[PDB]
Amino acid sequence: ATLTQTITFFALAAAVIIAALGVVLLDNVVYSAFLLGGVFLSIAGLYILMNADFVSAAQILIYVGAVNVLILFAIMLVNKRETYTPVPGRWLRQGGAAVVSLGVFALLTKMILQTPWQLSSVPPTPDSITTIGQHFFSDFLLPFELASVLLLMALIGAVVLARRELVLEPEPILGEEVVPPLELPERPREP
Template identity: 65%
Template sequence: MNLAEGVQIVSFGILAAMMLGAAIGVVLLENIVYSAFLLGGVFISIAGIYLLLNADFVAAAQVLIYVGAVNVLILFAIMLVNKRQDFQPLRRGWIRKAATAVVCAGIFALLSTMIVSTPWAISTATPAGDASVVVIGLHFFSDFLLPFELASVLLLMALIGAVVLARREFLPDDEADRAQVEALRLPERPRELVPSGRDETVN
C-alpha cells in the first residue's frame, strides 16, 4: 500500500463516519431544524465520497442540487410551517415506533443482502474521462427525464403547501390574546384635508 491509497482509505473512513453520524442525528434529534442541517452534512459527505471515486461532476451536482436546492427548500418549508400547537402524546404510539423499526430492519436486511451478493469486480470498461459530462447529459435528458420532472413537481408542491399553511391568519382564542394583538398594531395618523386651490404641504 502506497501513500495515495492510505490517504484514500483514511479519507473514506472519515467521510463514512461523518455521513453515518449525521444520518443518525437526523433520525434521533427532536429538533427538526437541527435534523435538516445534519441532512446537509450527509449530502456533503456523500459528495466527498464521489470525489474519492473521481466523479467530480457528480460531486458538484450533489452539492449544488441537494445541498444548495433540496436542503434549503426543506429548511424553508420547516421555517414557514410554524404551527403553534402543544405537544399531545398519541395513544398507542409504540405501534408506530415498532412498525418503523420493522421497516428499517427490512430495508437494512435488503441492502445488506445486495451488498453481499453483488460481485464487486473491477470494471474493465474505458472511463469516459472528460466526456463524462456529455454521457451524463445524454442519459439525463433521455432515460431519466421523467423522474427528474416528477421530483421537481413534487418539490414545488411541497413549497406551495408550506406557503399556504404559513399564510393562515392567527385567530386569538381569548381576550388576553386579542388585547396583545391590538397592542402590536400602530395607530393610524389622522389625515388632514387640504382645500383645493391652496398650495399647502401636509407634514
C-alpha cells in the same frame, strides 16, 4: 496515497450515517434540517473519492445549495404548528418499525457481500464532464428533454399549490348546489 484515501472514506462514511441518524432521531426538527446538509455534503464528498467530480459539484449545488435551503425555508414556516409533541401518541408502534428497517439491512447485506460483481479494470473517466454531456445528447437525450417538462410541471403545480389566492378570495362563481371556492364539489357527509 492509498491510506489517506482509505481512512477518508470512513471519515466521510461515518459522517453521513451520523448525520443520517441525526436527521431521523433528533427531537428538534430544525436541527434535523441542518444535519440533512451534513448528509448531503458528505455524500458529495464521497463522490470525489469515486471519480465523480461533476455529480459531486451537482450535489452541493442542488441538494445542499437548493433543496436543503428549500427545506429550511419550509421548516421555519411551520414552527408554530405544534409544541405539544405527544411522542407516545397512541401506542409503541415507533419500535415496530425498528425491525423492518434492520430486516431490510440484513437482507441487503446478505445480497451485497455474496453477489459476484463484475469489476472492470478499465482506466476510468478521462475528464468526465465531456463523457457526461455526450450522454445528454446521444444516449440519454430523451430523459434529458423530458426532465425539462418535469421541471416546468413541478413549477406549475407548486406555484399553484403554495400561492395565496388574492385574485378573488370570496368567489363561489355559480351554483347548482353550493360549492365552496377552491374545494372539491364532493362535500363531506356522515351517513
